[PDB]
Amino acid sequence: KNLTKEQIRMKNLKEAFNFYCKQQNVTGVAFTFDRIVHEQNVINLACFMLFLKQFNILNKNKYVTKREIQIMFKKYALNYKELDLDHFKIMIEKVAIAFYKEEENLSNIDRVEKLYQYIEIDNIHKFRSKFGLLNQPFNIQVKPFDQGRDIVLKKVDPVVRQKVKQFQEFKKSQQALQIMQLDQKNINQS
Amino acid sequence: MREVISIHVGQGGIQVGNACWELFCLEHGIQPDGQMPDAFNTFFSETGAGKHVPRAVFLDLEPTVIDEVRTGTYRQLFHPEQLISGKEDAANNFARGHYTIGKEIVDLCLDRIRKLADNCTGLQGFLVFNSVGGGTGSGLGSLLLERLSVDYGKKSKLGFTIYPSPQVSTAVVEPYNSILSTHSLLEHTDVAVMLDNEAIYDICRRNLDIERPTYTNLNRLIAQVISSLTASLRFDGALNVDITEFQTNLVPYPRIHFMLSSYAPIISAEKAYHEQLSVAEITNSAFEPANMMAKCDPRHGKYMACSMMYRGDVVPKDVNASIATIKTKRTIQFVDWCPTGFKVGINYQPPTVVPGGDLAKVMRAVCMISNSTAIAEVFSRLDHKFDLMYAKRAFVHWYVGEGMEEGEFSEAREDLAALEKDYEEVGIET
Amino acid sequence: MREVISIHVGQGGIQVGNACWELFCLEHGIQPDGQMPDAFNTFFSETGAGKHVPRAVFLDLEPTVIDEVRTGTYRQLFHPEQLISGKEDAANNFARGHYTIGKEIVDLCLDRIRKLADNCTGLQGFLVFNSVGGGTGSGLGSLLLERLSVDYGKKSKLGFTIYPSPQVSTAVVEPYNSILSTHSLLEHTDVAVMLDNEAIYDICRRNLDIERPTYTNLNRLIAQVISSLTASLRFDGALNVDITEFQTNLVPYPRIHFMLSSYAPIISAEKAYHEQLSVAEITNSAFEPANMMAKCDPRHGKYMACSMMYRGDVVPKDVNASIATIKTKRTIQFVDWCPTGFKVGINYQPPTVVPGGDLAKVMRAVCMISNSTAIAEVFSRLDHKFDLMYAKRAFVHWYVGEGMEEGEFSEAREDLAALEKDYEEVGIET
Amino acid sequence: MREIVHIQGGQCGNQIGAKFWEVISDEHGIDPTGTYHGDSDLQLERINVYYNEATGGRYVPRAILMDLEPGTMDSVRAGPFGQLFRPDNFVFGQTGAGNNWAKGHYTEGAELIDSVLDVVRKEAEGCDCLQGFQITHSLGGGTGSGMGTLLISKVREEYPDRIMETFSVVPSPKVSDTVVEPYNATLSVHQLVENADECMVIDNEALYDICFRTLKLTTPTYGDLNHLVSAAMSGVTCCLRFPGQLNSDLRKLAVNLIPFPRLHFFMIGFAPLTSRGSQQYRALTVPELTQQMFDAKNMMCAADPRHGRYLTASALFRGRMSTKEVDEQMLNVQNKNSSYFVEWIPNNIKSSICDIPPKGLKMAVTFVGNSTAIQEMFKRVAEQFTAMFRRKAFLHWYTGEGMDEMEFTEAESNMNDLVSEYQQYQDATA
Amino acid sequence: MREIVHIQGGQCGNQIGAKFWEVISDEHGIDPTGTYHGDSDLQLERINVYYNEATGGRYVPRAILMDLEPGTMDSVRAGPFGQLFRPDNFVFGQTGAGNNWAKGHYTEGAELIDSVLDVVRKEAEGCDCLQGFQITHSLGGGTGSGMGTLLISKVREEYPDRIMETFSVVPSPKVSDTVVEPYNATLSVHQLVENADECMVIDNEALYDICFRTLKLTTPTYGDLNHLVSAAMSGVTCCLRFPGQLNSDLRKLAVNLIPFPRLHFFMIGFAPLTSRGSQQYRALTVPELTQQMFDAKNMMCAADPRHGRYLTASALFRGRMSTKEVDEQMLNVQNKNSSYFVEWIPNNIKSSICDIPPKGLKMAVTFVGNSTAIQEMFKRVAEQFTAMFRRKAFLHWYTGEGMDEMEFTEAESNMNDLVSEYQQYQDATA
Numbered sequence A: 001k002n003l004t005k006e007q008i009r010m011k012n013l014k015e016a017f018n019f020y021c022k023q024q025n026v027t028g029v030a031f032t033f034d035r036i037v038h039e040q041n042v043i044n045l046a047c048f049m050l051f052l053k054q055f056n057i058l059n060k061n062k063y064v065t066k067r068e069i070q071i072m073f074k075k076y077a078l079n080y081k082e083l084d085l086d087h088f089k090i091m092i093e094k095v096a097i098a099f100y101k102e103e104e105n106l107s108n109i110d111r112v113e114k115l116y117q118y119i120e121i122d123n124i125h126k127f128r129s130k131f132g133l134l135n136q137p138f139n140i141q142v143k144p145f146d147q148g149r150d151i152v153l154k155k156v157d158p159v160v161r162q163k164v165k166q167f168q169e170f171k172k173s174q175q176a177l178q179i180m181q182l183d184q185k186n187i188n189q190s
Numbered sequence B, C: 001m002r003e004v005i006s007i008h009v010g011q012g013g014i015q016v017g018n019a020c021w022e023l024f025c026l027e028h029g030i031q032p033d034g035q036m037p038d039a040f041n042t043f044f045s046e047t048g049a050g051k052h053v054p055r056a057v058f059l060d061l062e063p064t065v066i067d068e069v070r071t072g073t074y075r076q077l078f079h080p081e082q083l084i085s086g087k088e089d090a091a092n093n094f095a096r097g098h099y100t101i102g103k104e105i106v107d108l109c110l111d112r113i114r115k116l117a118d119n120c121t122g123l124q125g126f127l128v129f130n131s132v133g134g135g136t137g138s139g140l141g142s143l144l145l146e147r148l149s150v151d152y153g154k155k156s157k158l159g160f161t162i163y164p165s166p167q168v169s170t171a172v173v174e175p176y177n178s179i180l181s182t183h184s185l186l187e188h189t190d191v192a193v194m195l196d197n198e199a200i201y202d203i204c205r206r207n208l209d210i211e212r213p214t215y216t217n218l219n220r221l222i223a224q225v226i227s228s229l230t231a232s233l234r235f236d237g238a239l240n241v242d243i244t245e246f247q248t249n250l251v252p253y254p255r256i257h258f259m260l261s262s263y264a265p266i267i268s269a270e271k272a273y274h275e276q277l278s279v280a281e282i283t284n285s286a287f288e289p290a291n292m293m294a295k296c297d298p299r300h301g302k303y304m305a306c307s308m309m310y311r312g313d314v315v316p317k318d319v320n321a322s323i324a325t326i327k328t329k330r331t332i333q334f335v336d337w338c339p340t341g342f343k344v345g346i347n348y349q350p351p352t353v354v355p356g357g358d359l360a361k362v363m364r365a366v367c368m369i370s371n372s373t374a375i376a377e378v379f380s381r382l383d384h385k386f387d388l389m390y391a392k393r394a395f396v397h398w399y400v401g402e403g404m405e406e407g408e409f410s411e412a413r414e415d416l417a418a419l420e421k422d423y424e425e426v427g428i429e430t
Numbered sequence D, E: 001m002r003e004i005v006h007i008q009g010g011q012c013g014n015q016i017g018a019k020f021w022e023v024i025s026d027e028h029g030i031d032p033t034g035t036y037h038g039d040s041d042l043q044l045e046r047i048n049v050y051y052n053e054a055t056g057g058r059y060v061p062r063a064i065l066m067d068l069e070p071g072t073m074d075s076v077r078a079g080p081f082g083q084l085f086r087p088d089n090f091v092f093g094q095t096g097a098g099n100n101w102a103k104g105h106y107t108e109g110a111e112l113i114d115s116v117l118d119v120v121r122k123e124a125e126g127c128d129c130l131q132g133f134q135i136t137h138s139l140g141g142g143t144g145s146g147m148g149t150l151l152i153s154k155v156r157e158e159y160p161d162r163i164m165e166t167f168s169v170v171p172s173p174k175v176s177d178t179v180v181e182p183y184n185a186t187l188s189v190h191q192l193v194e195n196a197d198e199c200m201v202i203d204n205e206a207l208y209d210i211c212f213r214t215l216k217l218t219t220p221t222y223g224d225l226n227h228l229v230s231a232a233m234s235g236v237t238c239c240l241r242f243p244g245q246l247n248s249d250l251r252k253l254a255v256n257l258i259p260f261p262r263l264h265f266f267m268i269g270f271a272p273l274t275s276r277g278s279q280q281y282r283a284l285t286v287p288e289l290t291q292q293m294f295d296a297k298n299m300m301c302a303a304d305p306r307h308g309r310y311l312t313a314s315a316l317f318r319g320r321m322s323t324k325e326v327d328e329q330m331l332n333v334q335n336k337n338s339s340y341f342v343e344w345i346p347n348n349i350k351s352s353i354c355d356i357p358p359k360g361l362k363m364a365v366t367f368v369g370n371s372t373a374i375q376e377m378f379k380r381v382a383e384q385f386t387a388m389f390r391r392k393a394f395l396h397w398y399t400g401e402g403m404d405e406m407e408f409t410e411a412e413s414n415m416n417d418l419v420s421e422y423q424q425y426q427d428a429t430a
């Protein structure tokens, strides 16, 4: 299967969007599942700043400071609080225009293209490796041998099983012979 | 329905058998006359009404010790005709007690063994005691083991041999018969425990604070070790261990079954109660190299497997918390191919005290049976002592003239060389 | 779940350890046999049923004091094999106890320390006691501190050293080993408290009105100071202080951690109750130069930080109203770069009295630990005493022949010069 | 109807059953003499699940006790509630296995198992509608891990459509009591995956950790570990013996917790657990139960459940409570921990409610979760196995009874394949 | 609805909460066993604000208690009303911080905070409609001022739209109990301004002054200071739990008292306060309440409010009274003191009336005023900080745990900028 150039980019951007939507620290008690589903499909200001920080854009110049990003977010966000996937794309384009604002010779399209190269969005593995959390464990009240143990199971492999394989066929033939000998003993004792 | 038969041969064997048989009778409440004024069944048998008879047999060619036994306070306990006695001593000559005078006595002993075995229904195994550096002891022990290995087969036999000290010695010819007896029991005994006298002398001097010990003090400690080993068969415990559950846990390979023991605590009543005797400190003292019951340094070799018994009010979690501390220490290192090497047993009955003895009454004790690679030093030094006199063929005429062939000395030397090579081959990491 | 381990080395260390261990046992209701007829856990450990075992270890190369301990009324309290004893004394020679005979004993002590530490789960830190003007005390203290600093690392260690008096002295060679031990513990101990005997003699004479004191009277006061310092860990209080909350409050710089202590009130029952012992008067008495526990004049130097503990029914507002009065006085001046220098702790448990002792029972007490710039005088006078004999190389042959190098004396002198320069550099205003 | 029979083997299994049956009898009000003395009508309606009826009105458990040595069953009979067991169901040998898997599975266990299979067949053929079997045994012993697993295959061959439970204690490397544990653990895991419909691993190390940290009792014993295991065992089948809002037999759990036939190794935990001193502080509410239920330290295994992702989970609430709260809390525990739940199977938590709480408690919860974090136990077991096997240590004991190294190689390969294919789904994504 | 959860940290915060919850329980008639025994219907209508419901009808506070040492929470449990707290919410470490901010914020506080954040998330996700959080902690301690402030940032990052309260005790230079107070005060004020929606400073010196002058009681203790702080804390949220003429939640106060987002540091006071002997002389009237409310000595801070001009003020009257009198008195207190009120914001006093008075009192008032006089506290704190920092005193303790001097410089600069820009509006004119 394949995706369009803006979309492959669009597919990778959607993957980043869906990842950061799930990082939201939702404040409040006893939510509806509709609200939880809504909040999983939108990015808040904190998660958008986290995205810009992890991609090394936040506070890099005077046009991408925490305050400037907050003003931009309130101006372009849905309900002044939330970004959907389309508003997230628009916000990244606005951040690209702000981030490269001092480069007068660049068109707005070239500024967005330069930002997409800067975040390495065309390489899904490098793009995904920049995704960072906020926090979770799986609820487990936590606190010489800690270093990890990669139990490399011995390949009972094509060369190794071969004898073992040959051995399974031999063992089946021996069991069939023992059944035939038990049947022949039952027939010869009969 | 679980039984065990103990064999005592030679002067040292009989003198340690006396030591263990005061302790067992005291521990089971049986008076010296044999009369009580269901745990006894492991060592004793009921006669129907009244007295109990030990499942033990005493062997010797020299009659003095048996006559001393048959006139002491324990004259009424033992069956009159299981104290087999000879007329002529082997006189420290191994060839005598294996070829000349032991053969005419061994048949009566085997008949007694059969008569005792037919009574038992759940026979766990045999115990044997013999001081190695003597003629009759080593020779008759070898002959009895060789006969039993074919009469019964797979039954387990345990040997509590007393090897000579590194430098302290009573005889002058004991390396010869020690090497020959090691040859004989290498392929014939399932477990052999080291018991040389010098280490136990040092233990008594340092802990018991006795400056003039005699053989009885040594034999009492050995008896306590035996009681600690066999307590699990006759008392209720949270984590039991049987005799047959040893070659599966302490014996990595059929050739390697020589291990050395230790015991803790050893302390007198004058200063025992001033300290709390926690489980951690006793299990630390048990692993101290100076408290080994055989004069060998465990720091010179790796460990292979450690089987160590507790008794008293010890709790398993405290035992685990102390095994972890020992695994932590950098001065004790185990062999590479053994990740876990500890077998733990816990029993509830505290050790019993013998009146007029040295040890005091305590609520916790630990006995360890540890198999280590460092044991090869005693074999090497015994071999060096043997070679010095075998170079000039000294004292050989006392052995050739008793029916033994000339070449019999060489093959024992070859088997010791093979054992020493095997111990080196096992201890190298992969 | 909070623990501390105290180390006692040398004759003076053992004799002050005895003094503190009557007091702790009395304060927690434990009989001398160790049996009670959840605050004990800081100093003791539960054995499961009955007795308690102190978290202390006694060290000495000379056996007389340990033998006296093991026969007194406290023979049943301490664990029998944590009273490590040697055979040959160092005989006031520092090189002996650091290079010749202390090395063979230090391994057992470290094994005991490990066995005690594995039991604790919330180990706060270590305490150590040693009289500095002796061979085994200073040498073994230095070696133990050096081993512990690398075995454990960041764990806190506190040293209650007893330096020699300005003019009163018992030995003739104590400046040498005092200087060497100061060198050793300068870079290895987190806190060092001054304890010279002359000041405490004057305290006893003036307040307790005893004209013929012995060492026990001094050790009881030291034990009371220790109890006051560690009360906050085992009793409920309105303003708690932990051991780890010291280097953040009393130690401005890593090199400067020598401070001198004081205690108040000190009064006998014959005239104690005639006066009200208000908090203001006791906190005034604690700051009196004549009541310093070390013979140093605080009027000769600035203060850096004062940590002072109360216990009893004291109310915080009365404490603040008394800190203000002290800040008011013109004879006590603090360093410029320290606007506030007081750390205050309040505890509810009144000090306990030992029967047959000197101190009476009171409801309020104060113990201060104060770091001041005036401490450099003791270093200067010890240095002057050292130089007089080191000019002619007197008594050096007793040290060179015990394995120590010739140049080892000079670098201790250089470190003392560096410390004295540092104390002068810190005390100047900006 | 839909009742199950109890079969236990080995010493560990016998000790587990000795408390499981006591707990069941106390729950149903059955006196140790087999006479009902309960209070509620519901206590007798479904008593046919575990108890049979005999003349005279007394009740007898349908339990079968097997071991290769008679000591443990001769000891359990003298304990409380020991008279309930029918003497006919006691089957034992006279030799024992000595912790050797080969002896308990090929030579000795093969001849004896006919007698126990006879009584097993007698018990199953008779009962109204069979639900299945539950098995308690230990993987650290020879006779247990051999005879129990061979009996599993024999039972499965005759009743392929019934359900089979196994509560298996695997040897942890922290608290090791036997040196040959890896061999018979690895050999047993090979056979256990092929035949058991459900398996529940239990570790002594996790039980000690729980007893020391949550209950905070000073001296754990095997009685406390057995009591916790017994409560967990009883919690699973509670709704099958009592009415409830959503009854859920064992087969319903089998359907909902096993995605693929080879992934049936669960780890369990019981809530609430509180100390004696804090049992008055806490208030029993559904949030309080569910927060402790998913706590990592509360699992009966040392495996850390936040090192992997749950494939599915189950909870069996007890007591009378609202279902809306249970469902919303289950949803909340799954929304706040989405990272630790596999994403390609939505709504992977099963809940059930039983209106009859345990005696003495108002609410209780039993947790059974299938998680990918269990791989770590097989990893360390195989690591020790391959560390010991590469040198062929202790191999001769097994190879002397008809077994070969090929069965060791196949077992290791199959165990490693299980480890790999169990984590294969951990990295699987939709 | 619109309920809040309680989170407290450190010893001081725990002691404040131990009285705050007692006051709340006494107000709502909840016995120390969690059983309601109140008299009025209104006592139960809005109990969901602070208390949760569990099975059995008992109530449990939704409080979370955290500290780096277990002593304080082990002590608060034994106090009155100590059983209400759920044992699951107790989270603690085994080491402590030792009044070192770096240890409680970078090394130790970072690893532990995950567990407490888990229970915090559990509590907030569940509740009907969140209003916000309230935090009690002290700025004079290490673990408190570190872990609490880092938790503030972590909570703010996840709930940016909720409201956040902090009741902070700042170290006064008069009553100083810790020498390292300026460092962790200055470091904490840096982080506190960036995240807290509201902050309320409380000083021990002002509490002692109030207790000595207004109540005129002889011996103040921490229980009286805690009681005053608890009454002030309860007064703020009274109208959110009871009906009234003009309800005003916390968000409404946030709107009306904070002109600019960085000016949210208030000082509070409670009226009436009368001595025991003069409680019969006085008559409770609105003029009598309002004259004491604006009294300078009645403020809970040593800051002198006639040294600056109020930006805004708030009053929360309690009891049944006429609104016309309240409004006219508020106008009169603003016409007679026009010099102390900023002129470019007219009508800068907010009033609210709640019809339910405190138990035992007929009228009560809680005062929350945002004034420019608070600059003096930051001035003196920064003065001490820069006096101590210029010599790098005690800096190594902080720099040894990954912190540097750059974070000290930034904190000092930001604090000075806050001081400057807070007074910038004092000289501003229209």
Ligand SMILES: Nc1nc2c(ncn2[C@@H]2O[C@H](COP(=O)(O)OP(=O)(O)OP(=O)(O)O)[C@@H](O)[C@H]2O)c(=O)[nH]1
Pocket (backbone or CB within 6 Å): B009, B010, B011, B012, B013, B015, B016, B062, B089, B090, B091, B092, B093, B131, B132, B133, B134, B135, B136, B137, B138, B162, B164, B169, B170, B171, B174, B197, B215, B216, B218, B219
């Ligand atoms: N531990 C211990 N060893 C002993 C005792 N008696 C003798 N031995 C050792 O036994 C060695 C010699 O063998 P013995 O047992 O004395 O004599 P024997 O075994 O009967 O052999 P014969 O000399 O032929 O009678 C000596 O080197 C001693 O070290 C004893 O009572 N206790």
Ligand SMILES: Nc1nc2c(ncn2[C@@H]2O[C@H](COP(=O)(O)OP(=O)(O)OP(=O)(O)O)[C@@H](O)[C@H]2O)c(=O)[nH]1
Pocket (backbone or CB within 6 Å): C009, C010, C011, C012, C013, C015, C016, C062, C089, C090, C091, C092, C093, C131, C132, C133, C134, C135, C136, C137, C138, C162, C164, C169, C170, C171, C174, C197, C215, C216, C218, C219
């Ligand atoms: N405060 C106090 N000081 C003591 C006491 N006993 C000895 N000292 C001091 O210790 C110094 C000498 O060291 P000691 O403790 O006596 O002997 P040591 O430390 O064991 O060193 P060695 O001489 O090698 O045994 C003397 O100068 C005394 O001032 C005591 O009981 N109390």
Ligand SMILES: Nc1nc2c(ncn2[C@@H]2O[C@H](COP(=O)(O)OP(=O)(O)O)[C@@H](O)[C@H]2O)c(=O)[nH]1
Pocket (backbone or CB within 6 Å): B238, B239, D009, D010, D011, D012, D015, D016, D099, D138, D140, D141, D142, D143, D144, D145, D176, D177, D178, D204, D222, D223, D225, D226
């Ligand atoms: N929970 C519990 N575990 C036990 C008990 N007794 C022994 N064990 C465990 O069982 C293991 C030894 O099993 P073993 O007795 O040799 O089994 P067997 O060979 O079938 O008799 C040890 O590692 C113990 O941890 C007990 O009473 N309770």
Ligand SMILES: Nc1nc2c(ncn2[C@@H]2O[C@H](COP(=O)(O)OP(=O)(O)O)[C@@H](O)[C@H]2O)c(=O)[nH]1
Pocket (backbone or CB within 6 Å): C238, C239, C240, E009, E010, E011, E012, E015, E016, E099, E138, E140, E141, E142, E143, E144, E145, E176, E177, E178, E204, E222, E223, E225, E226
């Ligand atoms: N109101 C009040 N203040 C206290 C109490 N206990 C301590 N404090 C104050 O807290 C300060 C010390 O804080 P600290 O205990 O070190 O906080 P921590 O480091 O978080 O444990 C002191 O200056 C006291 O004024 C109390 O019970 N009530």
Ligand SMILES: [Mg+2]
Pocket (backbone or CB within 6 Å): B010, B011, B062, B089, B136
């Ligand atoms: Mg003889």
Ligand SMILES: [Mg+2]
Pocket (backbone or CB within 6 Å): C010, C011, C062, C089, C136
């Ligand atoms: Mg001395």
